[PDB]
Design a protein around this ligand. Structure first.
Ligand SMILES: N[C@H]1CC[C@H](Nc2ncnc3c(C(=O)Nc4c(Cl)ccc(NS(=O)(=O)c5cc(F)ccc5F)c4F)csc23)CC1
Ligand SMILES: N[C@H]1CC[C@H](Nc2ncnc3c(C(=O)Nc4c(Cl)ccc(NS(=O)(=O)c5cc(F)ccc5F)c4F)csc23)CC1
Lengths: 404, 404
């Protein structure tokens, strides 16, 4: 005994409220062409912007991590925008989940969000209101997989061709606690640009992997801390390898200097998104790259700068006893050298199949267990090597690992 | 002074005809929700077919290489189906002289098509009408890039739950030339299955890379030769590396025994689609795997079976003089051995940075010219090594290269 509203090909039940937007807009569950949709109702004072918004998303190239638009209808009083129906917000995903049964789904979710953002930016569109509440989680497809989608383009700006920045004349679009600091600065000479989205995404990254925390604290003091640069990444412990890599990326995404934030396409290349196999492949390509480099050369000096803390003074003392026994039968590696620890890894990896069964047992299978054997014992190895080998980042061998 | 037809939210100008077909079929250029679309008009004698097939298109169309459906309108006389407006068919792409590829070359097109096909089969949808006329080429996107899309879903069937097969009662295309033989024979025990699409795809593959030829002849003799098993791949040359690899894949796709045809996901794993760098990596992983292998073990024995033709009696005599001069130090490399050829390749890849400038100059840069140096001189090496190392296809290191 429920009621239906039909405006053209868009139908919805007024009792199925999914949320409330800005300016007294309501979102309903509904139907369009017998597809499940979400239906946003807007006011007459919004008809000009909605047509501009719809024209933006109807005309832009489709992308799997940008929400799919279906149809707009107008009646005597309202406009209605139908889009793909989603199961949840990213906010509800983080509140209502336990990241043990998910595995790499949180990181895949952030990589999809970042792909969507890189797609917007390459169309010269700055979102300016990225936040967990308007990153949407799809309904499971026929195979049960889900994905993240960027939505809510009311605050976005399409830069003119040739422009790389926009002026603050419109003021401060955004939501308190996710606004880049250069947006709220009286004495900032440089116009904001695409990197306002990187700062917001950085906060989202930390929000997801911390399962609810914000780099700049609780919501009431959140935006004040941003202006002061008062951030804190406590949930990332500095001696767990996964947390070190995540901290290296996020710190740059939320950096106070906008020009120090990586573009969205840079973010996607970071080791935060590397599989175990690719990390070991990076260690191998590095070890091969520096095998004939002199100890006085710029590449090795960079790699050894701070190296004793990376290898924990003597890495041969921080490995398992069967691998210590096996390393002594051969030429001696220098225990304080990052380069030699990489050389030992490359050598045990290349000769894995002929290693004594005791040594293959403590290393574990190639490549997953093998690489974690080293990264879990030397949690700064990959981050430190990644930063040091930035010198070779324009060479063909290191193209899969960096971005130009 | 041109006339406009409006049927619901679909409109079109009947002067803008795009094609004709059976059952009084006409396709027009038109509009829907202010997008350019193609509009197909069908008769009352198709209302029954049409709705079932529109639903299957609506369940498949989220994949980027499946045509996107937009709207369907029922008319007091006809039915009208609006889909994404496209620029060309695959047929026009192959047969038109200076067809701008727009950053889309034949291999990427075939891989896009197979990706779409694999998406369908994973939804338990068999297409059953795959041919160049109903693979479409998109309009360029905002970045100027184009892609291929499967369409013409009028004959596609969703298999019943638990069936891997369908019966020949209701869904064989009226236009022949591209139909798997078991769809049209009578002496047939097994019922047709997904591999009817692979057979058609096999013919399309040849049609694209041969630039217009069919494996089974021209027009009317095609389907007759298909039922006969009389095919010919003579555009694929036996002494060109790309053609040898292409022939090894197309041959299994159009195989008479439907059970011997690889699935669409298996096709995608075939070296036909490997980048140059992946091919060089396969050679290195093989060479490492057999370095300590017994000369009389099954693996090396398998690798040397027919090795003389692969290395052309003496591979040391079929390489450039600078590389010959550089291999002189390695007197352990036997020129009659496929394994030793692989060992020399791996050794010069590993030590590439240290090689003299003469040697690097004839090899070319790593990894593209380097791997082509050898495959262009030993056009059977990859195909032979690939088949030979199938003995190691269940080992973790050779997971990426095979299909399990
Ligand atoms: N508890 C859960 C919570 C999640 C619920 N599922 C949802 N599924 C899908 N959408 C939503 C929403 C929601 O606001 N949609 C929405 C809608 Cl309908 C229209 C416009 C915009 N913005 S736009 O920029 O104008 C815009 C214009 C375009 F032409 C295309 C895309 C656009 F974005 C928008 F963002 C709120 S919830 C929810 C299910 C119940
Ligand atoms: N020289 C160039 C040539 C390419 C032209 N561009 C095109 N762009 C986009 N579509 C086309 C087409 C074209 O047939 N569309 C089309 C359309 Cl509109 C609707 C349906 C189907 N499928 S179906 O099997 O009929 C079919 C039947 C059912 F009952 C149910 C579902 C179905 F799916 C289809 F396939 C023909 S040309 C062209 C531009 C000029």
């Amino acid at each position: 005994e429920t009621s239906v509203v039909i405006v053209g090909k868009i139908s919805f039940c007024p009792k199925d409220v999914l949320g409330h937007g800005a300016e007294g807009t309501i979102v309903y569950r509904g139907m369009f062409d017998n597809r499940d949709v979400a239906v946003k109702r807007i006011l007459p004072e919004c008809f000009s912007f909605a047509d501009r918004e719809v024209q933006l998303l109807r005309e832009s190239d489709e992308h799997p991590n940008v929400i799919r638009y279906f149809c707009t209808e107008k009646d005597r009083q309202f406009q209605y925008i139908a889009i793909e129906l989603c199961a949840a917000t990213l906010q509800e995903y983080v509140e209502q989940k336990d990241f043990a049964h998910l595995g790499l789904e949180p990181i895949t979710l952030l990589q999809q969000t970042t792909s969507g953002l890189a797609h917007l930016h390459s169309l010269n569109i700055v979102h300016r209101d990225l936040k967990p509440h308007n990153i949407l989680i799809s309904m499971p497809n026929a195979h049960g997989k889900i994905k993240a989608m960027i939505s809510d383009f009311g605050l976005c700006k399409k830069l003119a061709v040739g422009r790389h920045s926009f002026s603050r004349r419109s003021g401060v679009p955004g939501t308190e606690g996710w606004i880049a600091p250069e947006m709220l600065s009286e004495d900032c000479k440089e116009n904001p640009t695409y990197t306002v989205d990187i700062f917001s995404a950085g906060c989202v990254f930390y929000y997801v992997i911390s399962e609810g925390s914000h780099p700049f604290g609780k919501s009431l003091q959140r935006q004040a801390n941003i202006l002061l640069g008062a951030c804190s990444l406590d949930c990332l412990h500095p001696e767990k390898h996964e947390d070190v890599i995540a901290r290296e990326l996020i710190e740059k995404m939320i950096a106070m200097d906008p020009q120090k934030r990586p573009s969205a396409k840079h973010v996607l290349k970071h080791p935060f998104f590397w599989s175990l196999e690719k990390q070991l492949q990076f260690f191998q390509d590095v070890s091969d790259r520096i095998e004939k480099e002199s100890l006085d050369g710029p590449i090795v000096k960079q790699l050894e700068r701070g190296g004793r803390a990376v290898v924990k003074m003597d890495w041969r003392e921080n490995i398992t006893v069967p691998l210590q026994t096996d390393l002594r039968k051969f030429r001696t590696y220098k225990g304080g050298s990052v380069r030699d620890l990489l050389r030992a890894m490359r050598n045990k990896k290349h000769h894995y199949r002929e290693l004594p069964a005791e040594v293959r047992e403590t290393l574990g299978s190639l490549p997953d267990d093998f690489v974690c054997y080293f990264t879990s014992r030397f949690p700064h190895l990959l981050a430190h090597t990644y930063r040091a080998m930035e010198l070779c980042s324009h060479e063909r061998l290191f193209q899969p690992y960096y971005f130009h």
